[PDB]
Design a protein around this ligand. Sequence first.
Ligand SMILES: *[C@@H]1O[C@H](CO)[C@@H](O)[C@H](O)[C@H]1NC(C)=O
Ligand SMILES: *[C@@H]1O[C@H](CO)[C@@H](O)[C@H](O)[C@H]1NC(C)=O
Ligand SMILES: *[C@@H]1O[C@H](CO)[C@@H](O)[C@H](O)[C@H]1NC(C)=O
Ligand SMILES: *[C@@H]1O[C@H](CO)[C@@H](O)[C@H](O)[C@H]1NC(C)=O
Lengths: 528, 528
Amino acid sequence: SELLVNTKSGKVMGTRVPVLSSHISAFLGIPFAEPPVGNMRFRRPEPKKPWSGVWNASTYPNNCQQYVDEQFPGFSGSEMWNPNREMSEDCLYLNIWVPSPRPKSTTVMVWIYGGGFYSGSSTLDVYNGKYLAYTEEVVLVSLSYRVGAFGFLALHGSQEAPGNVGLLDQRMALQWVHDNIQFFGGDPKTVTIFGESAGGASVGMHILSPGSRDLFRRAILQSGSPNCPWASVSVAEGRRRAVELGRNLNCNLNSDEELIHCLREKKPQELIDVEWNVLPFDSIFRFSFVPVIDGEFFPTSLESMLNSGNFKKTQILLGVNKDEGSFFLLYGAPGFSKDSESKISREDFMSGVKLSVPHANDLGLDAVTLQYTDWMDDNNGIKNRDGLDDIVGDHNVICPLMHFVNKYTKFGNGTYLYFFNHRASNLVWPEWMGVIHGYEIEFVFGLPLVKELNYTAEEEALSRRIMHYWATFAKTGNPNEPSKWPLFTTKEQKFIDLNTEPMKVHQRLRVQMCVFWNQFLPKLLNAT
Amino acid sequence: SELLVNTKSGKVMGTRVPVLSSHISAFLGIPFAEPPVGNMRFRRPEPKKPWSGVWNASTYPNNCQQYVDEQFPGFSGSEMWNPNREMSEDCLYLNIWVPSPRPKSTTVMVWIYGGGFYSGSSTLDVYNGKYLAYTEEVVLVSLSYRVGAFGFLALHGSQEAPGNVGLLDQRMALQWVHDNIQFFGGDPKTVTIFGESAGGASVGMHILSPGSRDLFRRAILQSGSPNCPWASVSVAEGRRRAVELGRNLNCNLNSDEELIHCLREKKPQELIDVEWNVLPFDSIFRFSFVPVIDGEFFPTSLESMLNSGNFKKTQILLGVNKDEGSFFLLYGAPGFSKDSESKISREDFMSGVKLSVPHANDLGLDAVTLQYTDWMDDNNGIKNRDGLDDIVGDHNVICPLMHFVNKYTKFGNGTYLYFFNHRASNLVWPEWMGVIHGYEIEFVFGLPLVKELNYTAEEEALSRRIMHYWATFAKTGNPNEPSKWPLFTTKEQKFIDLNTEPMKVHQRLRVQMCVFWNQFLPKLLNAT
Ligand SMILES: *[C@@H]1O[C@H](CO)[C@@H](O)[C@H](O)[C@H]1NC(C)=O
Ligand SMILES: *[C@@H]1O[C@H](CO)[C@@H](O)[C@H](O)[C@H]1NC(C)=O
Ligand SMILES: *[C@@H]1O[C@H](CO)[C@@H](O)[C@H](O)[C@H]1NC(C)=O
Ligand SMILES: *[C@@H]1O[C@H](CO)[C@@H](O)[C@H](O)[C@H]1NC(C)=O
């Protein structure tokens, strides 16, 4: 039977699913770790004990426990990102879409979801792997990992809540794929991990971390990179936030044992309810529990690892969207609203930059403001809104990714860079948000090929070339079929725009602004 | 006799001079102070003792002792600025051009020459007052004042070399004009002082200084303002440079008396020969002996005076040229040459900015470099040259003038701002220097009306409107004849370009760069 696969952990029974008037097989909710519940909450994941009998893999698993977005009740724009399954701490499962008939040894792609390390689900309709699997003949895998305090509460030195366990969940799933994907027809020697935002930062983290390198062949990072300012914290900041979380739950704070014990008795929603109270600053685009530079998963600082070539050398494909910051301003900066054009006054612009660069002294704040203000037209509301949008996107996504790419390329074996700037014709979000953070995902997963979703024919064509660029890169380490996407090089720094117009090649993606964020501002904050 | 004028200091006999196929009267070399020689060197000027008999005023006076430019021996571009008379410490004279027949009580314009406070002459062909006097029917006066150490050696507290004596020379000439111009047909109640570069900074200094305010009605400042970074020094820096000058001449340095006595015995050229050795930094656009913030001529800091409205309230007309910095780079920055296009490498650009902002720490230097570098094309030689040209002009002339104008306008009675950007068709300087510092003077003095000088007909027309704008402003406090040059206002900040094309009105002259130089950079250097 095509739907029965025998793995090293036990037999699994899949289900047949329709896709673009055909069918492929799906193995949903395969467990890859023991349930991290009870006294195992905050601990490193344990591998799933083999089971006898047949694991029913016909339906999606629970999603991990997480904050749920209620900003726009019922609005599809925001709810398409919320958990669409019941939540549970028992959430460590993976899903596999396999072409029919079963491949013998084909290219594998493993998706790692984003969500700021505090949210995310592998079961979202925009992450349905059937279109990509089917269209490109690849075995598509989506894993899951603990988020929020459950995945990243860090009390360095403690073995009970060491931190990074969410990253270790991802690693365990990659280990399982390495060990078992052959039985699904996948080639374990040709696995590409790919992910967006925190998922893209996670991808870069596995490229860096010695303990993860051997489990995959190449990588794709969308709108995220490991060195992003919101993607990690020191063990000291992690410790301080863990303690502050305990202080919010009236925990005994005398010892780590006392703290962890108290946190383990709290129901999931008690932790989620106060999670946001531990941030050190009034900020935007910052999340409470994220990866920690612990000296283990990350042997040293991320910058010294990037500088020294201490990372996996292979090919990478990565890029960003045009208006990465609009989401974060809508949700937390004064003057931005879902239903207005959100023209920003000069005072809101300034309160916007303070929120955007929480770690900056006043000189630094002045440097940012001057860098993004058109002084011939400082009261232009559209300009202030857009300027703020760029500050958020440049600081949080684009410039960190550009710093990663330039450092990586010195030691890597091949880099392909894109700038995604097509705004979907059917976007329900307002016009002022532009080509929003996360809205290239639907094209990567091929939603434009399903007529009912209402995209345009040219949008379907774009989705098809992105899928084929992604799958061909996974297969060969080059997105081009043997009009060309050129390699990004240290010298030339070439990249392509990704949209419905004839490909166009450019160079030095946002250099001007990124020399500011990657070279001048940090030098400025360190001297003052 | 039209050429004989009886003044309070004695009778003076002028000479008749031809001008544009007509004639006017000229009284050249009228003394207004006792010769500041011997033990009077470095001292405040003393008024000229009246003489009996007739002072022969038919020929130009000596020019003050000064450094002489020998960079391009025989080149007219540079020698047109050098003394064209024998030099002498006995140089305190003024020249007057009077319409014929003699006016009864007409508008007076008094020119104050520039030259970085270390050079300058009232007798230069480009300063010939006959064209303006004749064409606009004004009594035109050019004064002289001590420059270099002779005019600005400052040992605060000493009454022998108090500093600012060169400014006091200018004041004495303004006093003489106040007291005697009526006899030449000039109206002492309608005198406009006007000057370029250091002469324009001097004009602003008389507007500020309580002791000078009452001696004139209005003012015109060309490419210079009182708050320029090269126009003044603290009494401490003045003292240190005075002492260092003495140290260069092997002077006894035990007391001010010892120092001054030694400096007074040195021949003029001995002081001029080591003058440049006292600068505190390796720099460009910085001069050794300049005005000192002494608590007397300037009661307090220039900024607090500007901020508090502690200055003469009247109308002012002022502006800058497009490429103010080219001269200074040609003369002292690596990579610039008179006979090449001077395309600048990235390394020379950087050594250029260090020379341009001598007082800056490394963070400050980085801020300047980032502000003026196009990171999409950082090796563009033309761009590097031009970028450097703007850094020098913006920092030294334009932004300080824009700061002065915005502060002045809050309390003044009328401001008219221009941006002069026509490059003379007959310029002998290379093309890369653009609309060079000082080359609007020839249009203000009407050289384009003399056919042999080879300007174009449209250039003659431009000179005529500038002369009439300047003279009408002097007469009325408004350059317009009752297409309009609008008033500059705090709100609108309007200005006009001055060239051969139809007038065009703009706003916020170099705002972007000037917020950098007037607000951000100083805040940055003060915190670091
Ligand atoms: C597999 O599980 C689903 C979910 O409840 C169920 O509906 C389906 O009938 C099951 N099939 C088998 C063979 O157990
Ligand atoms: C990648 O590595 C291979 C094998 O070592 C080498 O031949 C090739 O030049 C490299 N490609 C790039 C783009 O560095
Ligand atoms: C005035 O002085 C000039 C300069 O030497 C001389 O040539 C001229 O003849 C003099 N005229 C009188 C009347 O002294
Ligand atoms: C200048 O002052 C006069 C007289 O006090 C006043 O009427 C006029 O409004 C002022 N003009 C400007 C431009 O301030």
